Symmetry: C3
Subunit: 190 residues, 3 copies
Amino acid sequence: DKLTLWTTPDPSPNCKIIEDKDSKLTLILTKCGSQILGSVSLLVVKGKFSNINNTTNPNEADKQITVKLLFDANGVLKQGSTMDSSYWNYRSDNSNLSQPYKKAVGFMPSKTAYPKQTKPTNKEISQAKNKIVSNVYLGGKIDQPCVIIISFNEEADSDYSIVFYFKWYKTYENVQFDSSSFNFSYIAQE
Amino acid sequence: KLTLWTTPDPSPNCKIIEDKDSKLTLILTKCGSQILGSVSLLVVKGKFSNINNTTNPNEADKQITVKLLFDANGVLKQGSTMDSSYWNYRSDNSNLSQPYKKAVGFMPSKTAYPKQTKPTNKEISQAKNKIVSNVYLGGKIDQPCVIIISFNEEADSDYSIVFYFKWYKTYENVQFDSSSFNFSYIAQE
Amino acid sequence: DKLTLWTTPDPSPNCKIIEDKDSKLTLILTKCGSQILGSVSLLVVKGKFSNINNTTNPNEADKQITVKLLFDANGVLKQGSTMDSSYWNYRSDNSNLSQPYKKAVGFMPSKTAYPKQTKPTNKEISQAKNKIVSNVYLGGKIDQPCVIIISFNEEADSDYSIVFYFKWYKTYENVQFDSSSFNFSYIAQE
């Protein structure tokens, strides 16, 4: 079938913000022909970001988290991605031999919608179209906003990329990084 | 693919304060492992049909909760805010007057959105079963209202979808009429 | 195949805000049965909005953009739409400009979800449900917000319409109108 590429709904820790498996990234990608429908949430279970305190840790580095998914020409997740390979595969509809996927180019962000940028800016080429910008809410609390920026194909060192950038502006005291669910879509490569 | 909905223009089908005082337009479409949803709420009778927070300034006068409660078969339970008058599958090639096993495919996943026990465990998310954003009353940018959609957090039901609307501004003669809000969630199967 | 109607993912200039072909609208509409899944972004490549300066150009008309898509009873784009029809077509295995489509009623916003309003507004009839109201971010920068209002079927002289209204409040100084990607959905006519 191959219409869902995901972490499953409840992965074990599968993401390295600071240390291996310090966080759980839940990511579902569903193919609806020419668009991928996504939903992402991030829970930090260990380390400074599992109990944010920006009085104790007041630097810019203490107020953001970047999760990078890097893919090769076959749409396979590359080593060096923030998310590890423990939970990343097609949803199975039958229980016959389980193998890592070899091809998911149909799940990749379009290279023509979201080309790689060169650093001489030109007014003819968008700098925004490959970004989705909004807020998520830590603990699902309205008074704990966190900006999310999802960027497509902006990593120079991979064929495709999906990057989730989380940055908060408020000084949080003893707040676990735990983002409310964020729904999004993008144009598929094929 | 398959759609469970109120239709696009239900008659009043919701009880905020009194029977059929409001119209909830709710469309759920199954797309693989996800449900794609859109919701809007119009209050046609009662205090919330003409919000006036000078006359009604209490906290209870500045929020609306719409609860959809479902049983183990994905059937809408009577105590839901929305009544069963407009809640059925979109007419296909074939017709059918009841939902049951097919309804569980529209329910929010219990694995994605598990119930929480006593004092919460820091290894289990509190946030992932919530979508938090803004809608705009009358579709007017200067009339924001927070929306929080919560999945499966109602203790006495197998599944739930709850739409919480809460505003901070003091609205004067503003009908509760929310701009359309799009969302998605992980399906039970 | 007839599940995606789009601008192509990388359109040449296709929009007249002020002058012919001053802007590139990227718009993808994908049919998922009863709902259309959309994503929109707008880059202005010529004219004042290609380098917004609201100190130089301080008036209300200098702080908003309207893109109108007007459709006939067949779902075909009408003359007087902001966008050109040449590259507005179904996605197929043919990636080149081709014969215009004849019918796309299945992509049109529902007349029952989004009826035209009669002059006496009525508390029984929603004024909001045919609108999606949010923010997009110029250049993908959280400090450059822009309101977006998408309105369905509100243009009096057309069978269907999708209108994208962009309006900003900040005094931008030398900021290209370049909107971050905005994801939305609406109820299909059939």
